């Protein structure tokens, strides 16, 4: 099995973008209608599901803006720094990306708290259980993703 | 641990170069003196150690020339073929690389036969036991190396 420590900065970035950023965008497109439906249908009975929709939307919009910043501005800066060019704001860039990750992590903590980890009541059927499983999988994937960035990619440039 | 289907050709090549090629060159530099000393001290009364020295040398020079060919000429062609440019000898390239790996593999089975699968005789000590340990691990390392190229890297482009 392949050890990410041997990748250099630009391969680690290509890997992140293929394994994490693009599947994340696609899962967001696919999953948001279901979160919205769950809120619309059972939110009146259960107000924590409306809070879940809004926390999920905030989580999603933050992640999309964060991945666009990484793809368009900041990952290219890490690559330039690895090649020997002068990059000021390199620790500014790293610190803002770490701040973004910490915020995303606390939103995941909140979503999981809202759903009692991701345990659906016996009242739940179909769309409800789908949303819970997908949100749990999105949390696992996001944890792996930001751990790769924080403890491998950023350590190679700091 | 990485999933190779998200590494493109360029990144997987960089991976192989950091994880196998450069460590293998370092290990050849460090291990050769010990092989030469084992054959010089114990070779006279144990001629299979002299045969082992000559087989190891052949295996090692073939590996070094083969990795040079991949790094300087053939891996860049795999990357160009991934990137759409015309590389009308790609299959020739892959066939010669596969044939090289076969030849190396057979040199390894020979080295293993000479050493009874790298288990030292009782009367061996020190340098003799060191050489068998290091050769055993270098065979393990080389099989992984060759399997990654043959069955992951070369299948991305053929
Ligand atoms: Fe990211
Ligand atoms: Fe990130
Ligand atoms: Fe190789
Ligand atoms: Fe090779
Ligand atoms: O991220
Ligand atoms: O190789």
Author numbering:
A (entry chain A), B (entry chain B): 67 to 224
The authors write:
We also analyzed a cysteine-free variant (C30A/C31A/C191A) by SEC. This CF variant produced a single peak at 10.9 mL, confirming that ScdA is a homodimer in the absence of intermolecular disulfide bonds. The high-resolution X-ray crystal structure of CF ScdA revealed a C-terminal domain (CTD) adopting a four-α-helix bundle. However, the N-terminal domain (NTD) could not be resolved, presumably due to low electron density in that region, suggesting that the NTD may be relatively flexible or disordered. The crystal structure demonstrated that the CTD forms a homodimer, with each monomer encompassing a hemerythrin-like domain that binds nonheme iron. The dimer interface is located between two intermolecular α-helices (helix 5). From the X-ray result, we observed that residues near Ser77 (S77), particularly S77 and Gln80 (Q80), appear to form a hydrogen-bonding network that brings the two monomers into close proximity. We conclude that an intermolecular hydrogen-bonding network formed by S77 and Q80 residues on each monomer underpins ScdA dimer assembly. Based on the crystal structure, residues H87, H132, E136, H167, H211, and E215 were identified to coordinate the di-iron center. Notably, the catalytic efficiency (k cat/K m) for CF ScdA is ∼2.4-fold higher than that of WT, indicating that the three native cysteines (C30, C31, C191) are not strictly required for nitrite reduction.
